[PDB]
């Protein structure tokens, strides 16, 4: 993988019409070219110009330096690779569009020529007409599918190459984008071919494009836990979070949610990370430490959970 890897009278009438057809062809050619240039450019120019400039900056710095450092150097090279891949996939997709459109353009121009010049006769028109109608059914879904895929990829553009996306609960990395399919890597790096015609109807998450993300730690305590210990728990958590501001934002909430029987109080801690979740492993490492801190606080404050007592009657 790229990511995640370890009778001159009639002769002249003919000629005149041939010239006209040729001009029509050139016109359409010009239209075709223009639309592809617009699509190809705007796709990237209005979305990641700034990432390109950041990449150039860091490489200028590396060249200068040559005349957690290593971690930084690696990140710089991995980001450059991601931009190169996005750039190459876009060029490829546009070239594929170019072939589809060029081919239809050529075919229609042949037909136009044959009919405007008078070469095709009545029987040929009838047969061509039928062939087009039949083709309209056969290739009907195909043409629709490609069109929708184009809109999804270039207009909606929910994700780029290298972004970590969420589809139906599956956190996956985008490896490659094409017109008919998107290729994703699952958390275990299984490669998945996912048709765009399906992807077009789903709600797609994108961690890469997200602002700093939040999280939750749910827990339970005994119903008899004094309100003072609940207050101490809130205070201890605040102190922890404030001593680790490289990982956590100061804002957090402790929510008391439910009293079950008279035995259990359900609670949840809401926190805010200083990162989005593109680096999933880092998210889990930071959360893991917070969970162990909660463990420690409960032990120090003597916060417990007991089961309801059971009354027993003994017969002999």
Ligand X SMILES: CCCCCCCCCCCCCCCC(=O)O
Verify binding: residue 21, a second copy, rule CB under 8 A. Answer: no
103 binds, among ligand X, a second copy, none (CB under 5 to 8 A by kind): ligand X
Among 63, 122, 228, 250, which residue interacts with a second copy (rule: CB under 8 A)? 122
DSSP secondary structure string, 157-209?
Answer: ----TT-EEEETTEEEEEEEE-SSEEEEE-TT--EEEEEHHHHTTS-EEESTT
Interface size with a second copy, residues (CB under 8 A): 133
* Smallest separation, CB 189 to a second copy (Å): 5
* Smallest separation, CB 145 to ligand X (Å): 8
* Smallest separation, CB 196 to ligand X (Å): 9
Q: Which stretch binds ligand X (CB under 6 A): 72-80, 159-167, 173-181, 206-214?
A: 173-181
33 binds, among ligand X, a second copy, none (CB under 5 to 8 A by kind): none
Q: How far lies 188's CA from each of 142, 168, 191, 192, in Å? A: 33, 16, 9, 11
What is the token pair recorded at 102? 């060029």
CB contact at 8 A, 183 and 192: yes
Verify binding: residue 18, a second copy, rule CB under 8 A. Answer: no
Verify binding: residue 181, ligand X, rule CB under 6 A. Answer: yes
Q: Which residues in 129-148 contact ligand X (CB under 6 A)? A: 142-143, 146
- Among 173, 229, 233, 225, which Cα is nearest to 5's? 173
Verify binding: residue 5, a second copy, rule CB under 8 A. Answer: yes
* Smallest separation, CB 63 to a second copy (Å): 31
Verify binding: residue 230, ligand X, rule CB under 6 A. Answer: no
Verify binding: residue 178, ligand X, rule CB under 6 A. Answer: yes
CA 93 to CA 276: how far, in whole Å? 29
Q: How far lies 126's CA from each of 111, 130, 303, in Å? A: 13, 6, 87
Q: Which stretch binds a second copy (CB under 8 A): 42-50, 53-61, 159-167, 239-247?
A: 159-167
Q: How far lies 191's CA from each of 6, 90, 160, in Å? A: 15, 21, 17
């Amino acid at each position: 993988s790229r990511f995640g890897e370890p009778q001159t009278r009639k002769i002249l009438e003919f000629v005149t019409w041939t010239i006209v057809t040729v001009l029509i062809g050139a016109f359409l050619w010009l239209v075709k070219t223009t639309l592809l240039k617009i699509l190809a450019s705007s796709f990237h120019l209005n979305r990641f110009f700034d990432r390109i400039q950041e990449s150039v900056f860091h490489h200028s710095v590396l060249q200068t330096l040559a005349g957690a450092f290593a971690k930084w150097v690696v990140k710089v090279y991995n980001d450059q690779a991601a931009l190169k891949h996005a750039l190459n996939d876009n060029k490829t997709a546009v070239k594929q569009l170019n072939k589809l459109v060029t081919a239809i353009l050529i075919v229609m121009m042949i037909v136009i020529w044959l009919i405007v010049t008078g070469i095709a006769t009545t029987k040929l028109i009838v047969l061509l007409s039928s062939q087009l109608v039949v083709a309209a059914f056969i290739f009907g879904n195909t043409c629709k599918t490609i069109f929708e895929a184009i809109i999804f990829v270039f207009v909606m553009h929910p994700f780029d190459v290298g972004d970590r996306c969420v589809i139906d609960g599956n956190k996956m990395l985008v490896e490659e984008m094409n017109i008919l399919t998107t290729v994703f890597l699952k958390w275990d790096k299984e490669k998945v071919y996912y048709p765009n015609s399906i992807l077009c109807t789903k709600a797609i998450g994108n961690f890469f494009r997200s602002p700093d993300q939040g999280d939750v730690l749910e827990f339970s305590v005994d119903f008899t836990t004094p309100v003072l210990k609940i207050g101490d728990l809130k205070d201890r958590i605040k102190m922890y979070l404030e001593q680790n501001l490289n990982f956590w934002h100061p804002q957090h909430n402790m929510v008391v949610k439910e009293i079950e029987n008279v035995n259990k109080i359900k609670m949840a801690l809401f926190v805010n990370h200083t990162i989005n979740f593109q680096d999933f492993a880092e998210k889990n490492r930071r959360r893991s430490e917070l969970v162990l801190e909660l463990k420690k606080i409960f032990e120090e404050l003597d916060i417990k959970y007991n089961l309801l007592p059971q009354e027993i009657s003994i017969r002999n």
